Amino acid sequence: EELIHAWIADMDFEVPQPIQTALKKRIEHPIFGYTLPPENIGDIICNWTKKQYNWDIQKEWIVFSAGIVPALSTSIQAFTKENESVLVQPPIYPPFFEMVTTNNRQLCVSPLQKQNDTYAIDFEHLEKQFQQGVKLMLLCSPHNPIGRVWKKEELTKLGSLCTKYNVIVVADEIHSDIIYADHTHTPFASLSEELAARTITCMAPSKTFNIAGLQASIIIIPNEKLRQAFTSIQYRQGFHGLNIFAYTAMQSAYTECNDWLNEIRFYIEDNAKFACEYIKDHIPTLSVMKPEGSFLLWIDCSALNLSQDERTKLLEEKGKIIVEPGEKYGLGGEEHIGINIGCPRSVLEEILNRLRHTFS
Amino acid sequence: EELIHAWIADMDFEVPQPIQTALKKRIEHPIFGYTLPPENIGDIICNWTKKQYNWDIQKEWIVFSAGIVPALSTSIQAFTKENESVLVQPPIYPPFFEMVTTNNRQLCVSPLQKQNDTYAIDFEHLEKQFQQGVKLMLLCSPHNPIGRVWKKEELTKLGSLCTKYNVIVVADEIHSDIIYADHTHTPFASLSEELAARTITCMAPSKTFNIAGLQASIIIIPNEKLRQAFTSIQYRQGFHGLNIFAYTAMQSAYTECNDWLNEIRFYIEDNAKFACEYIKDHIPTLSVMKPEGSFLLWIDCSALNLSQDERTKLLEEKGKIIVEPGEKYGLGGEEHIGINIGCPRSVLEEILNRLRHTFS
Structure with missing residues (x-):
């Protein structure tokens, strides 16, 4: 029912505290x-x-x-x-x-x-x-x-x-x-x-x-x-x-923020593993090459032989989800989509759930 | 006393409290x-x-x-x-x-x-x-x-x-x-x-x-x-x-910030009138055409008959002051200086006292 935006450029995690703290501190010096x-x-x-x-x-x-x-x-x-x-x-x-x-x-x-x-x-x-x-x-x-x-x-x-x-x-x-x-x-x-x-x-x-x-x-x-x-x-x-x-x-x-970054690296990598396994096990019509960095998952949908418009419509109507279309990435991007795995596992689970329903 | 820098381009008044408050309120949402x-x-x-x-x-x-x-x-x-x-x-x-x-x-x-x-x-x-x-x-x-x-x-x-x-x-x-x-x-x-x-x-x-x-x-x-x-x-x-x-x-x-701005306008103009009066009465070798806006005072130093370097050195050594040279402003800027009157009266008063001593 409830629309999802599986693709944002930004990671879905709150900024490290030390950064927020530094910003608030800068403001208590009121010359800008x-x-x-x-x-x-x-x-x-x-x-x-x-x-x-x-x-x-x-x-x-x-x-x-x-x-x-x-x-x-x-x-x-x-x-x-x-x-x-x-x-x-x-x-x-x-x-x-x-x-x-x-x-x-x-x-x-x-x-x-x-x-x-x-x-x-x-x-x-x-x-x-x-x-x-x-x-x-x-x-x-x-x-x-x-x-x-x-x-x-x-x-x-x-x-x-x-x-x-x-x-x-x-x-x-x-x-x-x-x-x-x-x-x-x-x-x-x-x-x-x-x-x-x-x-x-x-x-x-x-x-x-x-x-x-x-x-x-x-x-x-x-x-x-x-x-x-x-x-x-x-x-x-x-x-x-x-x-x-x-x-x-x-x-x-x-x-x-070295500690925070260490925890985020591990969390994202675990999200990548979780998603690649899920797709391999439950959405056989899709294929994904495991990322080695960043928090974007790059999914090949070419087995469904859909046009970009067909795929996009089916994704939002049947999956109630909006992902990153791959065609605008140029050669190799056609029939691919991108999703943001820099999010809470619970959220990533729901996204994967929507993808399964759509391409199954 | 210590060297004064009356050439800064920013006014010397604190940012409006409301802007400081809005910046804090924004940081309370730690998504950037x-x-x-x-x-x-x-x-x-x-x-x-x-x-x-x-x-x-x-x-x-x-x-x-x-x-x-x-x-x-x-x-x-x-x-x-x-x-x-x-x-x-x-x-x-x-x-x-x-x-x-x-x-x-x-x-x-x-x-x-x-x-x-x-x-x-x-x-x-x-x-x-x-x-x-x-x-x-x-x-x-x-x-x-x-x-x-x-x-x-x-x-x-x-x-x-x-x-x-x-x-x-x-x-x-x-x-x-x-x-x-x-x-x-x-x-x-x-x-x-x-x-x-x-x-x-x-x-x-x-x-x-x-x-x-x-x-x-x-x-x-x-x-x-x-x-x-x-x-x-x-x-x-x-x-x-x-x-x-x-x-x-x-x-x-x-x-x-409308109340703050009205107070600032009045204060600045009052500063401009004070400065023009002071120069007219106490620094004969300087002249000034009064500003109608902004917070910069444009002072004609022609009657001193000095090269830029000599005026600048006299200001720094004798006046202990650094001002904005007019020469870089192009034609009509030669033998002029600029000072910032967007500051507390006490600060402006010191600046003007230093100009007075230099060219006396």
């Missing part, structure tokens, strides 16, 4: 004018990358942005010219396509290849695209929506191609802190100095701690030449820095 | 994910313009921006091509210059003229500039730093020049809510349908309520075609809207 980044924020961020990924960065490499997508667009404007090619690997988070085309760059794609039980990069096909003169690549790592956490060996092969054909890489690593137990996130730029010199790395506490609304993002750009190009775009667009509470939330997110 | 503008914010802004300026606007005209300077940039990108002319009237807030030039547009200027002991538009010079093919004009109303609150007759005459040469007008009206007793702010777009159809109006609670750090701005664009071009630029730059507390602060600023 122009602010520079707190003195310690740079050291706080350097510590985070070392602690989380064994990645040593310089404070000078840090640039702030009010969101990752803005950062993607800034990179496109800074590092390519109109009518130059920008490559992505579908199925991929839709704003990737949008930021390319709305800026009048040419879209190139190198679709990921669904293997048995996993998605993989098609290095042969990708190299062909680079031979066509790709200038910039938007890498998603971990990859939304399929949930791949790229292994060192995969990223190294990718990096070899990027060095060979001189492709600048924008690494969207916003899901880098929600990594499952048997996996480890390797920042693309950390592989070598060579790759650090051609990578713009985009990170944020937004998804991790559920503070997307606060608009805090951290862009790391080792190469001073690329970094100056990036900030020059920001400047001409009138960027002033982040809002006051973006800095406050970051300060707390990266220092006082 | 993506949010659309609160349902009632459209009506709140419409009621604001009607109440403050007797200006009737439509909800659909409203577009949000994380700051006014970003809106100036967006307008430049939306309404002109590279190497096309954008006109400003110096002395003027420096980012007006920067946003034109860093976006590779041709900067044109029509310096304000001093006459009858007030600043005025040089309409003959302005028209000459328009004949050379100006596409866009950045109007500052009230005008920073000189504090002119343009009269309806001046704005109508400006409007007819823009109509004659089909110039689009970006009206930066961020100081529209700090207007002194004997003056009235007339939004440029409110003058007529003809002018509304060619104007982008930029407003914000930032300066008024000392919440610049929350990055909340309102852009009103009556002409659907201009408005869609404006939002298209935002979109390609990745803009998803304002941060959560930007909406919260605005909701409160435009509904619950």
Whole structure:
């Protein structure tokens, strides 16, 4: 009876207490004018990358942005010219396509290849695209929506191609802190100095701690030449820095929420296991590749041979549920749906229940 | 004593209590994910313009921006091509210059003229500039730093020049809510349908309520075609809207702070009269044309006959004070300084005493 929205971008868990506490505290100082980044924020961020990924960065490499997508667009404007090619690997988070085309760059794609039980990069096909003169690549790592956490060996092969054909890489690593137990996130730029010199790395506490609304993002750009190009775009667009509470939330997110994050990682991973088993056992018309990170489940509905409209209608009428349609993710997205497993188990159980009824 | 910094751009008064309260109340709900503008914010802004300026606007005209300077940039990108002319009237807030030039547009200027002991538009010079093919004009109303609150007759005459040469007008009206007793702010777009159809109006609670750090701005664009071009630029730059507390602060600023604002207006104007009196009586080497709005005092230091560096060094060493230099404001700014009178009387009194000692 009661409609459900199985897909939201945000995790369905309350923000860590320490963050709320930091925000309330900031308010008891009732001056809210122009602010520079707190003195310690740079050291706080350097510590985070070392602690989380064994990645040593310089404070000078840090640039702030009010969101990752803005950062993607800034990179496109800074590092390519109109009518130059920008490559992505579908199925991929839709704003990737949008930021390319709305800026009048040419879209190139190198679709990921669904293997048995996993998605993989098609290095042969990708190299062909680079031979066509790709200038910039938007890498998603971990990859939304399929949930791949790229292994060192995969990223190294990718990096070899990027060095060979001189492709600048924008690494969207916003899901880098929600990594499952048997996996480890390797920042693309950390592989070598060579790759650090051609990578713009985009990170944020937004998804991790559920503070997307606060608009805090951290862009790391080792190469001073690329970094100056990036900030020059920001400047001409009138960027002033982040809002006051973006800095406050970051300060707390990266220092006082380690326990919370550990508990959330485990809870989400358990949700992923629960859902993949449930679908395997009770909805045989569906198939799902187990995610290695993030809190999105990516479900293949191709066995039902439904059009997007048929599927969507059947889902809301017969299942009273609204999920993420996959078609807009590009090649590989057709006949797929996405659901948010970053929610209470009781809630996830009900969602799975609705899916069973619909496709059974 | 210790060095004083009378150049800050924020007023030195505490944020309204109601805004502080609204920020706390919002944090009591510890979900800070993506949010659309609160349902009632459209009506709140419409009621604001009607109440403050007797200006009737439509909800659909409203577009949000994380700051006014970003809106100036967006307008430049939306309404002109590279190497096309954008006109400003110096002395003027420096980012007006920067946003034109860093976006590779041709900067044109029509310096304000001093006459009858007030600043005025040089309409003959302005028209000459328009004949050379100006596409866009950045109007500052009230005008920073000189504090002119343009009269309806001046704005109508400006409007007819823009109509004659089909110039689009970006009206930066961020100081529209700090207007002194004997003056009235007339939004440029409110003058007529003809002018509304060619104007982008930029407003914000930032300066008024000392919440610049929350990055909340309102852009009103009556002409659907201009408005869609404006939002298209935002979109390609990745803009998803304002941060959560930007909406919260605005909701409160435009509904619950009317008593605070009336007290602030009176206090600031009283400060301006005090300062002009003090300078006229006790600092003969300085002159000041009185402001009609905002909280900046524009002081002519011509009679000192000093280079910028010498004036600045004398102020820091002898006066123990740092003020806003006028030189960066362009033509008409040379040998001027600015000071913030949006502060307690006791603070203003100390500032003025330091100016007195320096140039005595």
